[model samples]
Target chain A: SSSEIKIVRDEYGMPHIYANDTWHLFYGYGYVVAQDRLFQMEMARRSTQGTVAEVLGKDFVKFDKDIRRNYWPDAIRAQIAALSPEDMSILQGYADGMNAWIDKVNTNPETLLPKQFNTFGFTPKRWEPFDVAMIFVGTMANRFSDSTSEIDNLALLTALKDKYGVSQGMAVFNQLKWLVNPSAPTTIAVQESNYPLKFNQQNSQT
Target chain B: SNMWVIGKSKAQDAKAIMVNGPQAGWYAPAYTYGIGLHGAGYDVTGNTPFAYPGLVFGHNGVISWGSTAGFGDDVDIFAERLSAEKPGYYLHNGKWVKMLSREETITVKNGQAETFTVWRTVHGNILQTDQTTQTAYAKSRAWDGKELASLLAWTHQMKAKNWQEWTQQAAKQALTINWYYADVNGNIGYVHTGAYPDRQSGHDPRLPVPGTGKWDWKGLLPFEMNPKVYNPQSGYIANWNNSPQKDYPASDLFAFLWGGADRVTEIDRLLEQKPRLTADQAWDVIRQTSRQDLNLRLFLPTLQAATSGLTQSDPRRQLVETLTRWDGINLLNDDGKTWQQPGSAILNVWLTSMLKRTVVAAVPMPFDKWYSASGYETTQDGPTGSLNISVGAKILYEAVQGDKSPIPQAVDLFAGKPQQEVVLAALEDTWETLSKRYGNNVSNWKTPAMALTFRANNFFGVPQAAAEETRHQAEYQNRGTENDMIVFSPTTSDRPVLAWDVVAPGQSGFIAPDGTVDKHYEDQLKMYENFGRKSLWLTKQDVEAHKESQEVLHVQR
Candidate 1:
């Protein structure tokens, strides 16, 4: 009875809980997410675990092949395996709490499953620490590589230059001098000689 | 600067090659590396032209620095012709200064190193000129003291102590590149940085100036002269190849910079109208389908005027009523009412026809007469005038098709034609389509909500499934619209938000097999719909929140 929980949603539909500890929060989060997007979660887990080939047959064999070749998942798994005691404790707490909720749903046959999962004819797979890390590493690398392409750079630069000119390049230097033409010899010399070391340097020096 | 590239292998390190030229070349590699790192940091990889890898560096717990593509006229072409006086000397200020010359060897794969000595000027690098004409058409700036200082200007946030320092750093920059700076407080700030070079009064710098030193780069514009906002009242700062003017209201207080003015102008129109913005609302802004000047001046007017003739209770009023009730959120179903996407598509077609007719009737002369080309394009031998009109018309067409109102009045105001006639013609076209599609009982044209569909084994060699199956794998002709879009929110202290329904041209991934979404595509969508909408969560609590809604992949048994 003490472990039983209630949940409320914020204006944005973000869930808030009456759970007491970290485990409670995890249970509430997982339960709510499972309720809304079970199929989405299941598919994502399958893709991350490199099992798309099983469902897709020979067509997804190449993706599985690439995942193995990249070994990104393996690397994440290795990292999770090396987790410190404290981190492991945190994981265990969340895992136990999720298992508790899973048990409850298992007993209650009348409960409705997420529409996506029901339509897809599957149940959600359990979460793992490495799965989280793999998602992290995957998003980080992909997002980083795609945004820095030259064509986009050229367009951004062209737009910026057209509007602001060289001044967008000189904001700090200009502020540093705080005088007209910060690059001027007198201003430069003074700035260099009297550079403030800290936020309170102005008062300290005075 | 008239520029050339020179590759130098260091004496101690043969593998390290330093290519040096103007600020363009200096920032070029850094720009490339910086963009790549930025993309990598976000785990975003794609083949978009503008995306690149960028490396971030910091000291202790505090220092961080990153760079983005910055372009403004930090360098200018000067019109000066050197008169040959003595060998290796030129006349300047009534005296001959010895021109610095060194033999340069150009090595080709199957050819000999062509050796030549180029002269150097006090400005930086003396460029090759026409000897007889004595015209200094191309001059270059080196990575010397002054130029190095300029590069340092791009790296100011590297020394930031905290978030405030980062904000102050953004406020001071005059360059046009996105800046990434991290501090001891573990706060990271990314801002669009750089300066804008203004043309001389009464003179346009878009074209190559006459080589006589008559019109030289006088000096850089002041930092205060550039458009920038420091921790704006809006609690947001963002740009997606859009204008900073709207992102940073402080922009309008200064001389309008060149490229971002339109983008800024459009963004401000939506942003200024609201007091606070949610994460979802921020996503709407980044994915805004509304066209800038065209949306306000032309399309809305046209939409308003066309619907004005209909009574509020009339069946025709349904279209106007729906539009008036819209908060500009382009959801497939807003408040359970379906916005017919095809209906918008038809509306756009009619609007385009009306716009073209209006432009032609106003100036029944030559097509060129109706279209006055931009000064910049004219300098480059391209026709400008109605280019914006054509662009505006296309944007207007798309906006209305996307369920946005048409700006009939605004378009007429700028189209060099009478406002009401153009609007009437556009209305006729709209009414024609309405009558054809839904019949005279216009009120019967109810909102159509589209059901969300998900396919399995769709890509990565997955077999296509039938429509009846809930999780059947289906193929889409165009997969571009399916990828997740990662946008930096302008309101939530500028946190990043990932949108899955539609993505910007920059954030979409490289084309892959399956002709659908990638493996992580739907996962991100599910995550976006659940969490990761408005906040960058690195702390324990926030990170946990992110992990809870996260959908991990699991293989079939």
Candidate 2:
């Protein structure tokens, strides 16, 4: 279902979008996001999908490889497939709106394409169900994780053990005890339990 | 950096006012956006993420609020041992457990689609793999599938009429933030809200713990139990990501590497000086660059004593004289120009180099070893690791105040070099480095200016635009990125006014998608360079009154 949507721009060129329903609301959102950030969005999606080399050419192959090595496209598709009915509908509506804008650009390329599109000599791609899913996964993957720090810690510990004998290495570890101590109080209660004997086999083969 | 000053605490209008100055690299559409949204059930105006709904920092007609990073320890690392027989299985508790696995394919533009495999354990995503050691690590975070729900709830928060409703909605958010609230009702309060994990006792989450189920998080701490303060006697709440609680039991509420208390300490000092602060005075306090040089106060006498016996013709004597005669403020001639004084620069360089040397010598370890082991180094594309300069200063101060005879374990390697000799040598090195960069005329040595630049290439690359300022210097260029002073008067008719400035103007439109150049871009740069603050137009009436341009677009079903 669709409803009326209105977009008002203030003196600062800031958009104020209004819509009657969720579908139209996100439709307007997709339209504006594409209007202002089409090039940026395209590059981000390309980067995530490791398809940058296709657009930027051979120079980006290594970057494309790195991204492909880190992210999983199948996982993103599964995440999209697992979305709730309402979530799927909204995403579909957003894609429809974005595709409509892409159609407009195709009809009037000179006027609608951002300068970057002309400079790069490439046309914008139509939004797809999976395109949005990949964007979501790409943005969320590296956030809130610190694998580099983990590697650094491992390296530091190794260095300590090698340089200073076992006891001195332990001394270095003790000096960093504040890393484990609580800086403040908490209400989380502790519990003790024996290890489980049986291993969960489901999803093990996948 | 964010600060809120209550009106009752001020000697001026007695109206509650607050300031928010979040520093980041400049860009178009701005890192933050100002918009007015009107829908069936909502009519609100505030700044939000570009093209995103919900006000991150803004005020409705009835309520105003802002937030600063809480720096909580919401993510933990766990070491998982892979099962010997089952390749994708990891050991948990006492038995091998299956790990969730997925295969992903990425489409390369003009290239073939490449596929990769990703794995996850019961804890969370398996982020790293060590082929050499055959060990795998997983990162467990508080925010797995909660961000979207949190953002949706934030929209409701913008329209909330009272604190109870606002907080109730805000508690569902996954982002760890120290939220400050002020309503037209003349009330101000602070709450540190986030979905913090309740973990097992005895293990520090900072380092990787064994994934034997013993270190697994029990559950999330109830939102109601998060740190909060209401209507404190102090009449003001300021958070620079410092430790949230003063006297609480041992809990992993926040990370050990939270920002130093320097800014908050300076904030309290300024607020105490201005008993009845006015909105303008509040702005002044927010923009004050002169911190009470704690390092200088502790080390100045030592430096003075060390250089006192040097000949009058000595260059070190001249450097000492310059510092002794100069005031501690980091400003020049009231214009907010930071480059006029050289004392701040000299002291900054001296302290930074001295502290590093002292710490390394005391540890009896190579500088590189200490740096790596201390977890204070950052890679090209990693988070800024913990290298708190003030903490280094504090460590130096404590060492100096303690015993000095047979250099303590903290400074045992420095036993051969007397403390005074080290101090004098560091001062000489500081002068040499500064003069090499900015010339030897002590009078002409100005604090170096650090420019906050932005790139016009692409959105993601905007942060890489600025050149890193390497030299030790004292100036608040990035600290006061945006300053807001809100004064709530008695009458609702007298709406709260906000005065603010970004590091640069037209920063919001520098990389316009339409390729249309903004006239205000250069003007904003000049204004910010001159320490100018522009009054933000929040209300419809004010926006209309200050309207420079407008456009209208229509949508139909």
Candidate 3:
């Protein structure tokens, strides 16, 4: 046997995997997650891959468009190609773990299948390692990583400059932006610090 | 959305205290997945994003880590001039470059498939196209094409043994967020990591610039250059996504300009006041801080100061006095179940009237829900939940205190009236409104607490939809979805203390994946209502002690 993994769930249903290798460790993770959150996993991948319209129907047309415009085919391809061997193992094992669960459930039509599937009924597809990886990309890209309002800021700045010439507009915009006022509260502090610290990030100790 | 890692020096028994309380919208199975991964260079008993492959938040064998949105400057927008002759080309650095175009089709279930075209430039994605100006605004990201690579960094960091090893691996985090850390070795560290670009000279980052090559990014900010700290002399690291350190430039791209609001005000107050703390002592402060109302604490004092000279018989004087008894907790009872704080009720109407009269009157803002009276009810926590101390409150406080304002165009904060006069007028509106709603008897103004619930949202709108409608949904109290804490001891052999109420409501998500509803699905609901947390049991013997069941899966060669 290559490895033996124990998927021990606590009283709170927290999965504790005991494996000697990373593959078996994540394989337990995949299998357990599929068992606990299969329907949730299905929705995440479909949404991330911009194939939501394929399952959820026309209401999600704009949703699919928004995701694909930024991350679909090209970006997803570029990102997946860059995963490391160790990362690939973690993902691969996870996919297989989910597949083990999916493999049995697809035949039975119900293996801990959530009630959510009772309405819009269908079997979940077997996950590829890439499916597991891109959920992170999609989740982080959408929820956490970034949101830009530069275009709106530009519009405001343009309006300001248009109203009161460039020089005065500069002053008004600076006041509006209020870049890095040290008077605001801090988490980790530095005594006697000044505002507008010159964007000198390279210095390490400003 | 608050966390603190107090080192051994700041706590008793040479043990470090670490707490992570992350926020997410309520959901079935909750926002994060709880798991214990042990073996093969990986021994992490922590939580990861339910749908992703990363040890993004949790405690490893010797170290602990968590995250909050650090709001790093990573994305940019460029106004690219379209090529006049070539239909699919755009101008960059005096040359016409062909844009990459692809036909992407979205297939709809039970409906016709719609086909569309997506375009991209060298910068990144072409988010918008202006036909009139023949220009395209390309929204570029420094972390683009590096998302997976970013996640791979977590695999290494989760296994790191000490602060030096962990920080080295953490430096590779491609997506920016505040990575909060602590180790069994008695050290607490912090790092704000992500791929931040170094912009060229003379171009302001506040707005969109030309796509011509001159305005392009030079390179990324060095890892050490990003805001971070290592076992600071402060003896602890407390963060609520505040700027990592003083004088750090805030993101020009995100909602937090970083300088205006002091959301971290209470966290700093509680930690500095209580230097040496026990595990329970530290947690008490966190829970206490979460009970504060931004408006009652931040705005009421200034408002009271403005009218402090009023005669005792003056109705306004009595009103201000009623508000002062709140002490910012905004709750009248110690149990936190009853909302009998008349001051809270009064402030709610008072601030809304004051805001509508002043800021709204002069400059209407997009985030009106926050500035207005009813955004987050006064009972909920400050800044994060209430946003009571945001742009609107800042403007109001400045107007009342007569400080220089943050609004771009110079205008009166009080709409051309004396500060005291405007404050007094808003007070009259407050009493008039309160009397009408709660009646002239001010004692009846308090609102009784309504029980909140959680249910999984599912298709066919069955089980999960009643979701909230399910039986007993309203019986329990509501709270942030996750709470994890770790106390690191000096003795490596001794089992460190760990507890969590993650994936609240209960951990097992599928009630009937096999037509058998899991009993554990709703088991922890009561425990959570009482700060339900038990050990994650990182050690083998300890895990066995708490283990309810185990299934062995054989991986055959």
Q: Give the top-scoring candidate (lDDT).
A: 3
Model 1's alpha-carbon lDDT is 0.33
User: Taking the tens digit of each residue's C-alpha lDDT, what string does model 2 give over A122-143?
Assistant: 7788987567545544543333
Sort the predicted structures by TM-score, highest score first: 3, 2, 1
The global Cα lDDT (0 to 1) of model 2 is 0.55
> TM-score, B chain, candidate 3?
0.88
Question: TM-score: which candidate is best?
Answer: 3
Model 1 docking grade: incorrect
Per-model lDDT: 0.33, 0.55, 0.68
Higher-scoring candidate on TM-score, 1 or 3: 3
Residue B88 lDDT (model 1): 59
Candidate 3 residue lDDT tens string, B69-168: 7776688787778866777788888999988999988999898999988888888878844443478888878887777777777767888888788778
lDDT at B233, model 2 = 63
CA shift of A181, model 1, Å = 28
TM-scores for every predicted model: 0.39, 0.78, 0.90
lDDT of 1 at B240: 26
Report fnat for all candidates as fractions from 0 to 1. Answer: 0.00, 0.14, 0.62
Can you write out model 2's per-residue Cα lDDT over B76-168, one digit (the tens) per residue? Answer: 677888755689988888888888886765555565666667788877777644542456887676655554544445556776777797788
Each candidate's DockQ: 0.02, 0.16, 0.47
